[PDB]
Amino acid sequence: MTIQDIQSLAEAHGLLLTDKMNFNEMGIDFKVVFALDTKGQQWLLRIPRRDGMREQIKKEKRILELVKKHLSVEVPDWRISSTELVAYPILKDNPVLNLDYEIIWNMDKDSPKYITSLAKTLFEIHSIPEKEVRENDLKIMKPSDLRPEIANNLQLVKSEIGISEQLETRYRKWLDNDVLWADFTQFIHGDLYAGHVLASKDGAVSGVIDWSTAHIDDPAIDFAGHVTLFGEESLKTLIIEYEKLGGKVWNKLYEQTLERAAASPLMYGLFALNESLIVGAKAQLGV
């Protein structure tokens, strides 16, 4: 999309933009634009790639309104949120990392403030009450629903895209160990990793950016994005700090997280069902 097209689309929503912008396509279903308005204010624009996304946009608007109350980090403040344009003022800090693909870290990987601040944020997110989640017509998995639905995902992935025989055995084992699965499921961001976490250079986590995925689900899923990028020792430090704050853990949180992470290619496939290049990338990461 051209700058002038973007300017016109924003002007159709009463947002008057300069021609100074930069772009981000690392996202999946929306086009992202860093824009600047005629008043000097920096904006983040999310342009739906497709028509018919109204229900997702409304859902995420609800989620942001809901989580805004319960957190001490910034979240996007949607000022425009039609089916044609989502827009909010850019948040305070830049993401911990960017991806081209290739990781471009923006803070020191070993930043210790990141662990304590991230643990605080995970605690706040995971404290949000279930009645509010359900009120907002959000998806509610409960631990009884967890295992057979992941079984269904195995089913729909193996035949549709193929699965590694080793990948299949692990996933069947993981569903097997009743010990790994938590007694309790709590509201989760659902798409949480350093690329969606905003922080200063010292690693103090200022904000969380993409909330469309958030629903009540297993706690480990919020943990897994972290262990993939910072490693297992980091993860353990995060678990500790998280518990110290008062976060609901169980005896196998760490290992369940490890299994969630290992199950990345599986949930990759199932969400891919869409694009042939994403199906290609999965198929590789799965066989």
Ligand X SMILES: Nc1nc2c(ncn2[C@@H]2O[C@H](CO)[C@@H](O)[C@H]2O)c(=O)[nH]1
Ligand Y SMILES: CC[C@H]1OC(=O)[C@H](C)[C@@H](O[C@H]2C[C@@](C)(OC)[C@@H](O)[C@H](C)O2)[C@H](C)[C@@H](O[C@@H]2O[C@H](C)C[C@H](N(C)C)[C@H]2O)[C@](C)(O)C[C@@H](C)CN(C)[C@H](C)[C@@H](O)[C@]1(C)O
Give the active site residues: 191
- Tell me: does residue 56 bind ligand Y (CB under 6 A): no
Stretch that binds ligand X, among 21-29, 141-149, 217-225, 266-274 (CB under 6 A): 21-29
Rounded CA-CA distance 115/237 in Å is: 7
Cα distances (Å, whole numbers) of residue 159 to 175, 260, 269, 270, 283: 19, 21, 11, 11, 12
Shortest spacing between CB 213 and ligand Y, in angstroms = 5
Amino acid letter, residue 73: V
- Tell me: does residue 91 bind ligand X (CB under 6 A): yes
Interface residue with ligand Y among 93, 191, 217, 259 (CB under 6 A) is 191
Q: Yes or no: say if 128 and 67 are a contact pair by the CB < 8 Å rule.
A: yes
Among the residues of the chain, which ranges form H helices?
Answer: 3-11, 54-70, 112-126, 130-135, 143-161, 165-176, 220-245, 253-262, 264-271, 276-286
What is the footprint of ligand Y within residues 208-247 (CB under 6 A)?
213, 221, 224-225, 228-229
Rounded CA-CA distance 278/273 in Å is: 9
Q: Mark 106-145 with x for binding to ligand Y (rule: CB under 6 A) and - for no binding.
A: ----------------------------------------
Interface with ligand X by CB under 6 A: which residues?
24, 26-27, 32, 44, 90-91, 94-95, 98, 195, 209-210
Q: Which residues bind ligand Y (CB under 6 A)?
A: 28, 99, 101, 103, 191-193, 213, 221, 224-225, 228-229, 264, 267-268, 271, 278, 281, 285
